[PDB]
Design a protein around this ligand. Structure first.
Ligand code: MG
Ligand code: MG
Ligand code: MG
Ligand code: MG
Lengths: 204, 240, 231, 212, 233, 222, 244, 4, 235, 195
């Protein structure tokens, strides 16, 4: 009965040279029972990407909530929300539920369309912003991801190299966690093109 | 909250706001209800000062409250939507608690109760709407046709009309409708309904709407061509 | 004229016309008489009927074993005020194990009627009450007016032609006050008092209504054949 | 407590015991566990005494208000659902009720609804409710047929309560019998287990476990 | 839900032929600490009632204020406030009894045991008990806390039933009360030597005695007691 | 933690005759092992020939009696001084008791009087409002001692006609007010012997068409 | 009390009309004309700005045409401030529907709800009605392209072509004359502008006094695109049809 | 607990 | 304008007095109380011949022992009946007994003056409440929107009330049978009604201790109408 | 309440739901239908806490039916499932949550495709080719992983479903008294009477 480790799952985000990557596994289970191998944890609102690990009902609820808010934002502002702004919106929304929180570990990723700067950020369940140059990790195999990212990561990786690093970080972390895996998705994000790749991994 | 007593008695014993709500009904487009031996038919006028209309999407005059009951009206259109919504909610609520769909009388009694409540509640004005509620009770083949009005009174009718020039079409129905022998078939009932509207309408083109309701949730709306055939048939028999 | 639209408005001479119009409703009401001695207090009320087929409107209401009133004016308002008295008498008994003083009863009615004369939306009570009772300081008689004014008296009368009975009691004051330990004689004085307010009609068996409370007498009402003795 | 009611060819039989207990203390042997809602509706009571007694007499008032408003006797389905929707509002508050709403109407025919305090509402032909329900089931099921006569059905319902009254410590006192037909319910008497047991033992030749 | 902090121990009382006596020590304990020594736990209401309170002192001070306010409220629009419409012991008790029960019913009790002693307008003795639970009872002798266990037995030897009340004088009654207070001082660990005593008589009225002391105490025999069994020295 | 309930002990007993009914109850009031009062009445005349007792937690008992007495008073006001029948009183009390279903009056209530045919009536309630009319009921601390004795002596349970081979039961019959009071007094003396919370005094309230009479008897004070 | 100063906004006239709704319609009749025309392959929204000043910033301005979501837009006629209150409500309602059902709101549902709000102000609350008439132009997968109008009464109706605001009588006659069912968007664009050009109270119709928008399926394969015209784009379309 |  | 709960200079509530004018416009309703029962009869008054007269419900059951007829703005009576039915059933639940006819009437009349600036105006309908209880026997009450109720031996309300009441004054005596009362209601209704009285445009009902409150069938009333005409022609 | 299964095949969705209703040591009923029709082409099965299940199912049914009348239009299975999920998502953070797990089987008439949604009491929605709630999954999922093909017919689906029920009847501890099977396709909802 630990909300953050019922369904399982992981998200990881990295920065590269004029690019960002965000990746997630596909598993959704009920403790030991694997239920779905198509459950994607990464969403996007315009050019801003949001990965969410934790309790699956909240993952879905927050996606729907941030779609709701970014749509109204766009109508009033007459422009797409930026990663720095969206990060503050996520933080606000989570802390609004301070004493009845969504059991989630969100991760923002994207490139600011004005400045062109790669941006990533992480949060705890009550909205504390964790900004990082290098990488953000989240989920049931966060320890494993921290270990993989800290050793494998190096700054200013090209999109094609960054893909290999983030993918290997996710896969080997997922293989040491019982509640993560069952497939994976990696988004490579450049200034005005985004590539989405499904990884081949062990299905146990 | 806004508390003002808008509906109040006058020296002569009248509630003018309720009576002025009837004037709004009198302004509204004509609506007619005729019940046959095994069916009820709801006819409705549509004014022809509005061309360039989109009849696909324009709110229909006759509304389904449940799969077995329908509601037409005359008066303020915006007001009618509120009553219809409340009626539809009550219809589902009745199925949920009683495990049986509403009777036509019960649904009418509810809608009439809502209309009455607005004649002695503070801050609100009466509904500028009179309704014709028609249908068949669950597991029953006897046709039902009821009328309500802003004051909240309701009653059952063999045939009835409301709206503008309704006194003319009521005059027609009073001599043409036989209590001892109502329209035996669907065709006879529809024809009498169309005939009655043709006393008032103008042209029988896209001015008349007809909706037929039959037992066991069998409701269907007639198209232009289907209605036009009745109009064509009636005019040829008239020239005699 | 322009200052009688509601109770919240003063007239240029400093009058409250809605309160005065409420007072007028009492004058139209049927006559009722109150009087007391040192041992007992008596209410006598002329009941009114719609016609010969109707019943006679009940004028007297019991509030506790030791207290009650007679009404003149809007009967539903008397029901509201008498119900309030019943609750206050009852509160005193349950909380303090104490019979409510007739004087406090009056103060409570005064303050309840007053609130309706100073606020927008409401209206003054349209009824006059005569409260009798027997408490720790002996027999009492109060006159309540919907303006809020409550007055303790030896005797009084309110309603239509109440001046006739009120003049009589003013003359008889020295006599009836000393009718101690004699209920029937005190009632007789009250019945003779209310008779001074009669015109064309006389006191019949289903017309007269009498109530009494005293030292060893709980508040009890007499109607029908029980008042035939006093005609 | 032990209560049953079953449906058969000739309508509905309803049978209950009359014991009330406070732990191991036998508080009463003469409790009415069948409520007479109207000439066509019955309700059985098991669980908390007050909860059953209070809410089923309340149910009767709601059924009366229905027929005043609708000029028509309430259906067994509608009546049971008023009760089931009521107890559902109190779910988790600790109400303890195991009831059966039994009756006849034109549209439904003979109908039995099981309604309990955790919100379960079930239509069915046979139900036994209470601490001695399993004992009643054992006898009732093994002897039940749809084609039972009114005489045999009444006896089986009585015999099933007796079986439970015997084995279940918290059931006993006396048996109350009802028969529900198209014309309404018919009371078939109070039967004390004190005399009924020996009468049944002798005539039937059953209860050989007991010292005769 | 409360827990009592600063507490007052036993209140003892009894009826006699012409009135009632009530007494209570002047201690305000803070658990095992004998913290406050000048605490008056007998509170007169008018000239015909004395309310004795044990238990939580903060709640006692609240009750004082209520009684003080009750006298003020009774005087309003009351020409007979010092005569026929003066506060009776029965009025004061019933008020408190109502409050105590209302408070327990809201799960927020006034953590006290109260004895209302007084004389009614007709000369009848009034003595009734009420506590944090709203439980009420009356008796010829009433006592709270340790008083219930040690005083009542002694006081009941004087007035064992209703018929003994006319036979009991104020001298005999006061002597028993004072004797009971001494026994409580011997045996109640949360008691003090200093106490107050009040007599409400139907003839002589309210007599309030302050700063009384337990005296004529037997301690001499203690010198002979040596060891806890065998020890001779 | 504050416990809002307490046990004030004592026991009560109601018996119904043909044209009368009695409601008896001991006058002892206790807490734990201490006596609070040797004479504290808990059987009350509530008017309209209804006598009532609510035994158990005395505070809740007094509150309930007080509320019912008040209910009788308002029944007169609202319904033209109509006499409250014993059956109507019983139903009214159920609603009082069940009104506090989720914070109960910890009392066994018994009322007694005459029904609308002039016959003796006793009604008994559990703490939360379930009620039943009976010829016989004991309530309170010594109910478990007294009740089976009543089953045997009032309702003649387990008693068969001599020489009938245990086939014919002893026939039921109404008891006289004299015979009932004997059973009450013997019930209470027996309960006093074997129950520590029962004793001091016995107060019986007898209800006939003429009114409500009282009788008092001493009980052992140990 | 305060009764003395109550206008009683929600009452009937002896003739059975709602005073405040009728007067609100009178207000709206002085507002800049707005026209909606529905074609088989799209919808046109055209609106005339209210007597423009030369120093008004035209490009970064929004007076008549507002976006409710990706698939639905509205043309306003009446009090702009009132309209914006209703537009934000409508925008929220569309997002509530999307959040609940994971599907874009059907046009009529949005129109009904917004019309139901207006109705409320005429029947209760004692407040003045919204002095606003809308033309709703939108698309969904059930009915395709749809035009509606709502007014202060809270009554809404569907249209093939419709005008609101000033000179609707003259404008509706001209639309009724030249409109036909097999019309294309580009033809409807021309009709909209021609109608405004004749019904306008101004001397000549120019780009700076107009707002324009289209809702086509002109995007790539089975998807709808909203085009709120820029000042230069209106200037070009005005020349292309031969008005200036 | 109660009385069943 | 002016306040809803305002007094006139004569000492009457304007709104209560105006509601009484609305009741005079209402259809006639007549009630007669006897020792064998209470009879209630009403004029249906269909506004048009197409209206199905059997759907006109102006006589109504409150409980098995209490009935009710109405006159005036009949839509206003629905919540009054709803309250009366609830009061009657609620009292049975609390006290395991039938509720007194007077107590029921008093409960209904308490709603009457609960209006002001609670509901926005008084009721525009008068009620004849007829019933039976063990204490005061067969009773007939007239409940007005003023909050006042009088008990009556006989009473007529509606448009032909003053004429019918004068007729009831002469005709009523304390030894009337139920059958005599039934005919008397029909007789007086036929006199004051505009259209000719028959079983379709007039309805009868009664309440007896034995059978309780019953609305008569059109077949039963038709025979009483025929019996009435024959008896008037017989002298 | 215990066993509810769902299998989406080529042209239909098949829902199987146990018939047993057990309270204590007594099977009170053996013919219980643990499903409600939300709309002509949408069916919802349910399982969980007693009382909550039916109360929730009927509340949803009423809401969907209300929508159907208002718009004269049938909501898509995707739309209905989203509505149901949101209700459960609200419910889980209520004072007393609905402890109900559901399967929603529907046929989308616009897409001409069958759709199966699995939603637990927390508001956790997933679209699946086959689904189950409770302990059933622990046997059926592995079995279906092996034997399921996406292009199966309705008849092949029923045989696949028989294989699940047999395995459950063999290895499950409790007697669930067989299942009621219902098929949802282009022609609406119908029940298989002999299973
Ligand atoms: Mg793994
Ligand atoms: Mg594995
Ligand atoms: Mg002892
Ligand atoms: Mg799940």
């Amino acid at each position: 009965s630990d909300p953050s480790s019922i369904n399982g799952g992981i998200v990881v985000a990295m920065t590269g040279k004029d690019c960002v990557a965000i990746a997630c596994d596909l598993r959704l289970g009920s403790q030991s029972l694997g239920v779905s191998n198509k459950f994607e944890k990464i969403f996007h609102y315009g050019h801003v990407f949001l990965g969410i690990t934790g309790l699956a009902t909240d993952v879905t609820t927050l996606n729907e909530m941030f779609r709701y808010k970014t749509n109204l934002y766009k109508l009033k502002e007459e422009r797409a929300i930026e990663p720095e702004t969206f990060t503050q919106l996520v933080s606000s929304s989570l802390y609004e539920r301070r004493f009845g929180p969504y059991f989630v570990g969100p991760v923002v990723a994207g490139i600011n369309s004005k400045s062109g700067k790669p941006f990533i950020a992480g949060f705890d369940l009550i909205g504390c912003i964790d900004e990082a140059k290098d990488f953000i990790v989240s989920g049931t195999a966060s320890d494993q991801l921290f270990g993989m990212c800290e050793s494998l990561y190096e700054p200013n990786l090209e999109p094609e190299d960054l893909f290999e690093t983030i993918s290997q970080a996710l896969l080997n972390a997922a293989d040491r966690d019982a509640l993560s895996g069952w497939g994976a998705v990696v988004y490579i994000i450049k200034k005005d093109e985004v590539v989405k790749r499904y990884l081949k991994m062990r299905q146990d | 909250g806004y508390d003002r007593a808008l509906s109040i008695f006058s020296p002569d014993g009248h509630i003018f706001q309720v009576e002025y709500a009837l004037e709004a009904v009198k302004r509204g487009t004509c609506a007619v209800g005729v019940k046959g031996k095994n069916c009820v038919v709801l006819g409705c006028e549509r004014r022809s000062t509005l061309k360039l209309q989109d009849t696909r999407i324009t709110p229909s005059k006759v509304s389904k409250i449940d799969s077995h009951v329908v509601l037409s009206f005359s008066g303020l259109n915006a007001d009618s939507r509120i009553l219809i919504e409340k009626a539809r909610v009550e219809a589902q609520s009745h199925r949920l608690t009683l495990e049986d769909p509403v009777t036509v009388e019960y649904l009418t009694r509810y809608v009439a109760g809502v209309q009455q409540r607005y004649t002695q509640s503070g801050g609100v004005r009466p509904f500028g709407v009179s309704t014709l509620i028609a249908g068949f009770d669950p597991r029953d083949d006897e046709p039902k046709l009821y009328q309500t009005e802003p004051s909240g009174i309701y009653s059952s009718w063999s045939a009835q009309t409301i709206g503008r020039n309704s006194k003319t079409v009521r005059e027609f129905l009073e001599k043409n409708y036989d209590r001892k022998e109502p329209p035996a078939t669907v065709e006879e009932c529809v024809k009498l309904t169309v005939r009655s509207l043709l006393e008032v309408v103008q042209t029988g083109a896209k001015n008349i709407e007809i909706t037929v309701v039959k037992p066991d949730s069998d409701i269907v709306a007639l198209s232009s061509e289907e209605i036009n055939q009745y109009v064509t048939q009636i005019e040829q028999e008239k020239q005699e | 004229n322009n200052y009688d639209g509601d109770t919240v408005t003063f007239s240029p001479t400093g009058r409250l016309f809605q309160v005065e119009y409420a007072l007028e409703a009492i004058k139209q009401g049927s006559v009722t008489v109150g009087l007391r001695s040192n041992t007992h207090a008596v209410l006598v009320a002329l009941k009114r009927n719609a016609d010969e087929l109707s019943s006679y409107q009940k004028k007297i209401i019991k509030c506790d074993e030791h207290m009650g009133l007679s009404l003149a004016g809007l009967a539903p308002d008397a029901r509201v005020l008498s119900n309030y008295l019943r609750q206050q008498c009852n509160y005193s008994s349950l909380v303090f194990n104490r019979k409510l003083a007739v004087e406090r009863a009056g103060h409570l009615l005064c303050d309840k009627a007053q609130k309706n004369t100073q606020s927008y939306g409401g209206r003054p009570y349209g009824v006059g009450l005569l409260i009798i009772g027997y408490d720790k300081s002996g027999a009492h008689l109060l006159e309540f007016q919907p303006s809020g004014n409550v007055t303790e008296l030896y005797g009084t009368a309110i309603g239509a032609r109440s001046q006739g009975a009120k003049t009589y009691l003013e003359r008889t004051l020295d006599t009836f006050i000393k009718i101690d330990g004699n209920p029937d004689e005190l009632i007789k004085a009250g019945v003779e008092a209310i008779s001074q307010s009669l015109r064309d009609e006389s006191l019949t068996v289903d017309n007269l209504s009498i109530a009494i409370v005293g030292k060893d007498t709980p508040f009890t009402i007499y109607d029908g054949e029980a008042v035939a003795k006093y005609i | 407590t032990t209560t049953l009611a079953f449906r058969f060819q000739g309508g509905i039989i309803v049978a209950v015991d009359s014991r009330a207990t406070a732990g191991n203390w036998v508080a009463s042997q003469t409790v009415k566990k069948v409520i007479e809602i109207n000439p066509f509706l019955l309700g059985t009571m098991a669980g908390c005494a007050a909860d059953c007694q209070f809410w089923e007499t309340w149910l009767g008032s709601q059924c009366r208000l229905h027929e005043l408003r609708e000029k028509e006797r309430i259906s067994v389905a509608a009546a049971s659902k008023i009760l089931s929707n009521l107890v559902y509002q109190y779910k988790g508050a600790g109400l303890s009720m195991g009831t059966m709403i039994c009756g006849y109407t034109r549209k439904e025919g003979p109908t039995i609804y099981y309604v309990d305090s955790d919100g379960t509402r079930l239509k069915g032909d046979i139900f036994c409710v209470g601490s001695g329900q399993t004992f009643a089931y054992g006898v009732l099921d093994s002897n039940y047929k749809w084609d039972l006569s009114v005489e045999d059905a009444l006896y089986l319902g009585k015999r099933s309560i007796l079986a439970a009254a015997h084995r279940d410590a918290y059931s006993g006192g006396s048996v109350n019998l009802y028969h529900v037909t198209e014309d309404g319910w018919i009371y078939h008497g109070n039967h004390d287990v004190g005399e009924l047991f020996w009468k049944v033992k002798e005539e039937e030749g059953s209860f050989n476990n007991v010292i005769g | 839900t409360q827990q009592p902090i600063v507490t007052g121990t036993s209140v003892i009382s009894m009826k006699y032929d012409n009135g009632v006596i009530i007494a209570a020590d002047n201690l305000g304990s803070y658990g095992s600490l004998l913290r406050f020594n000048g605490v008056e736990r007998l509170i007169p209401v008018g000239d015909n009632t004395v309310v004795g309170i044990s238990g939580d002192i903060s709640d006692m001070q609240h009750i004082e204020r209520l009684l003080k306010d009750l006298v003020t409220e009774n005087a309003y629009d009351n020409p007979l406030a010092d005569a026929e419409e003066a506060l009776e012991p029965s009025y004061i008790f019933e008020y408190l009894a109502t409050v105590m029960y209302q408070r327990r019913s809201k799960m927020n009790p006034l953590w006290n045991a109260i004895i209302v002693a007084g004389v009614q307008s007709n000369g009848d003795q009034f003595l009734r008990y009420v506590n944090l639970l709203g439980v009420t009872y009356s008796s010829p002798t009433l006592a709270t806390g340790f008083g219930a266990h040690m005083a009542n037995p002694l006081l009941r030897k004087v007035v064992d039933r209703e018929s003994d009340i006319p036979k009991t004088t104020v001298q005999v009654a006061e002597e028993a009360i004072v004797n009971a207070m001494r026994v409580l001082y011997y045996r109640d660990a949360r008691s003090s030597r200093n106490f107050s005593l009040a007599i409400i008589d139907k003839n002589t009225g309210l007599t309030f005695k302050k700063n009384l002391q337990v005296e004529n105490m037997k301690w001499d025999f203690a010198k002979d007691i040596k060891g806890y069994g065998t020890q001779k020295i | 933690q504050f416990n809002p309930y307490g046990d004030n002990g004592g026991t009560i007993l109601g018996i119904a005759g043909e044209d009368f009914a009695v409601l008896a109850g001991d006058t002892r009031n206790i807490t734990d092992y201490s006596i609070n009062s040797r004479y504290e009445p808990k059987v009350f005349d509530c008017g309209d020939n209804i006598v009532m007792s609510a035994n158990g937690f005395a505070a809740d008992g007094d509150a309930l009696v007080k509320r019912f007495k008040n209910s009788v008073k308002w029944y007169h006001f609202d319904h033209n001084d109509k006499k409250l029948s014993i059956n109507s009183a019983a139903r009214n009390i159920q609603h009082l008791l069940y009104g506090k279903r989720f914070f109960p009056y910890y009392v066994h209530t018994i009322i007694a009087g005459l029904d609308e045919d002039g016959k003796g009536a006793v009604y008994s309630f559990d703490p939360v409002g379930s009620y039943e009319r009976e010829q016989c009921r004991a309530g309170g601390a010594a109910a478990s001692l007294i009740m089976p004795f009543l089953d045997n002596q009032v309702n003649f349970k387990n008693q068969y006609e001599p020489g009938t081979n245990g086939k014919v039961k002893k026939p039921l019959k109404y008891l006289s007010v004299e015979e009932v009071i004997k059973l009450v007094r013997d019930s209470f003396t027996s309960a006093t012997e074997r129950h520590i919370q029962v004793g001091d005094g016995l107060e019986i309230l007898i209800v006939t068409k003429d009114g409500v009479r009282k009788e008092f008897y001493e009980l052992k004070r140990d | 009390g305060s009764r003395r100063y109550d206008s009683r906004t929600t009452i009937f006239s002896p003739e059975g009309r709602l005073y405040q709704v009728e007067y609100a319609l009178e207000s709206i009749s002085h507002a800049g004309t707005a026209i909606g025309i529905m074609a088989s392959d799209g919808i046109v929204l055209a609106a005339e700005r209210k007597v423009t000043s030369t120093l008004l910033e035209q490009d970064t301005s929004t007076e008549k045409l507002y976006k409710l979501n990706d698939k639905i837009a509205v043309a306003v006629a009446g009090l702009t401030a009132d309209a914006e209150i209703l537009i934000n409500t409508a925008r929220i309602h569309a997002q509530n529907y999307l959040k609940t059902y994971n599907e874009d709101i059907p046009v009529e549902i949005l129109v009904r709800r917004l019309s139901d709000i207006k109705q409320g102000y005429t029947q209760h609350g004692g407040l003045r009605p919204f002095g606003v008439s809308f033309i709703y132009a939108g698309y969904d997968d059930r009915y395709g392209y749809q035009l509606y109008t709502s007014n202060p009464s809270g009554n809404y109706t569907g249209w093939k072509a419709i005008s609101v605001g000033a000179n609707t009588s003259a404008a509706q006659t001209l639309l009724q004359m030249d409109y036909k069912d097999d019309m294309k968007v580009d033809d409807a664009i021309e009709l909209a502008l021609k109608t405004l050009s004749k019904t306008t109270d101004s001397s000549a119709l120019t780009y700076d006094r107009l707002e324009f928008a289209t809702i086509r399926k002109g995007a790539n394969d089975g998807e709808v695109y909203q085009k709120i015209f820029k000042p230069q784009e209106i200037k070009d379309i005005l020349v292309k049809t031969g008005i200036t | 607990x109660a009385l069943f | 304008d002016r306040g809803v709960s305002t007094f006139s200079p004569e000492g009457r509530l304007f709104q209560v007095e105006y509601s009484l004018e609305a009741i005079k416009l209402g259809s006639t309703a007549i009630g007669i109380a006897t020792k064998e029962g209470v009879v209630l009869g009403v004029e249906k008054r269909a506004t048009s011949p197409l209206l199905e007269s059997d759907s006109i419900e102006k006589i109504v059951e409150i409980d098995r022992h209490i009935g009710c007829a109405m006159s005036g703005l009949t839509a206003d009576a629905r919540s009054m009946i709803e309250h009366a039915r609830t009061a009657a059933v609620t009292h049975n639940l609390y006290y395991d007994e039938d509720i007194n006819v007077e107590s029921l009437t008093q409960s209904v009349c308490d709603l009457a003056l609960r209006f002001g600036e609670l509901m926005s105006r008084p009721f525009g309908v008068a009620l004849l409440i007829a019933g039976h209880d063990a204490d005061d026997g067969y009773q007939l009450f007239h409940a007005e929107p003023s909050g006042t109720f009088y008990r009556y031996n006989a009473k007529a309300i509606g448009s032909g009330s003053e004429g019918a009441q004068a007729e009831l004054l002469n005709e009523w005596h304390s030894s009337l049978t139920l059958k005599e009362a039934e005919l008397l209601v029909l007789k007086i209704l036929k006199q004051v009604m505009e259209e000719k009285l028959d079983e379709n445009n007039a309805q009868l009902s009664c309440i007896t201790k034995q059978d309780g409150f019953k609305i008569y069938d059109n077949e039963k009333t038709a025979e009483l109408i025929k019996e009435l005409k024959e008896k008037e022609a017989a002298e | 309440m215990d066993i509810i299964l769902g299998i989406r095949v080529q042209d239909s969705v098949i829902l199987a739901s146990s018939k047993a209703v057990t309270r204590g040591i007594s099977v009170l009923k053996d013919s219980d239908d643990k499903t409600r029709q939300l709309s002509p082409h949408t069916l919802m099965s349910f399982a969980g806490e007693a009382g909550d299940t039916v109360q929730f199912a009927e509340y949803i049914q009423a809401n969907i039916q209300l929508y159907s009348i208002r718009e004269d239009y049938e909501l898509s299975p995707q739309a209905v499932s989203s509505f149901v999920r949101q209700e459960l998502a609200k419910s889980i953070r209520s004072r007393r949550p609905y402890q109900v797990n559901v399967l929603i089987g529907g046929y989308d008439k616009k897409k001409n495709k069958p759709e199966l949604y699995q939603i637990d009491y927390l508001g956790t929605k997933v679209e699946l080719p086959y689904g189950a709630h409770g302990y059933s999954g622990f046997y059926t999922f592995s079995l279906l992983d092996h034997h399921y093909r996406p292009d199966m017919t309705t008849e092949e689906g029923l045989d696949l479903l028989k294989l699940c029920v047999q395995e459950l009847e063999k290895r499950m501890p409790m007697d669930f008294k067989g299942v009621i099977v219902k098929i949802v396709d282009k022609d609406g909802i119908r029940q298989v009477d002999d299973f």
